[PDB]
Design a protein around this ligand. Sequence first.
Ligand code: ZN
Ligand code: ZN
Ligand code: ZN
Ligand code: ZN
Lengths: 138, 138
Amino acid sequence: DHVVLRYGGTREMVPLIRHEQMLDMLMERARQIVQGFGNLDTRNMYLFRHEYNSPTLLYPITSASQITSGSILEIILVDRTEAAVIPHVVEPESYMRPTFCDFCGEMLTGLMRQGVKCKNCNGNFHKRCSNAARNNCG
Amino acid sequence: DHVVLRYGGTREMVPLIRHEQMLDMLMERARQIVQGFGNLDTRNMYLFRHEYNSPTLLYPITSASQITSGSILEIILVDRTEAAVIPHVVEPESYMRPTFCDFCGEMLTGLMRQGVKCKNCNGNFHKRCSNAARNNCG
Ligand SMILES: [Zn+2]
Ligand SMILES: [Zn+2]
Ligand SMILES: [Zn+2]
Ligand SMILES: [Zn+2]
């Protein structure tokens, strides 16, 4: 029973308890992830989840209740200068050993053509995942 | 009875009605401001207000009620690659003709030293304003 945090180009699993300070704790993991990149100021750090069935859309998390198990939460420093997205350019791909979707962390499933592969950063994603918000090609 | 919208390096006044679709309308002005910069996609556009007495902090707007008259709302495309802030480097300044705070739009008041002036972008701000979130030096 997890959630996934994402920042920079890094994902991390965090066990999802239902408990009053669940959100406090996710936030401090988030803060720790970002200082993992380098003392970036953190006062306007927010988590945004991807919408059910529509991963191009983000919703800000305000109460612990909006966190549902399995959700992908984005760590976003909202005070910080906007810059152009870098999208994966992607085409279908069949996989012969079990491989995981580089964005969401769950397994590509199916017989053939289990996901898409990006030509420039070589990642492996579900089609629904290859263009999720904040899945930038680094 | 206004609010201020900000995007890019531009501020705009919008009359604040209390009415069910007040937020709908601010959002579509916001969208129009951003396409003023160039067909940037807009599905993850959010407004954030600056906190009372603490302009370095932003809070996302979710219901029309969080909008209070006079507030400075930031227009933020949250799906979009983070980038380092560019802060004003600023020192006090006395003003001899009435001049407005370039960030918030209200007048510098006082007798001497009514605000601060930035050496590189030459702007005029209240001290509380010279380092508000998203008041980047362009
Ligand atoms: Zn890629
Ligand atoms: Zn996936
Ligand atoms: Zn400046
Ligand atoms: Zn001001």
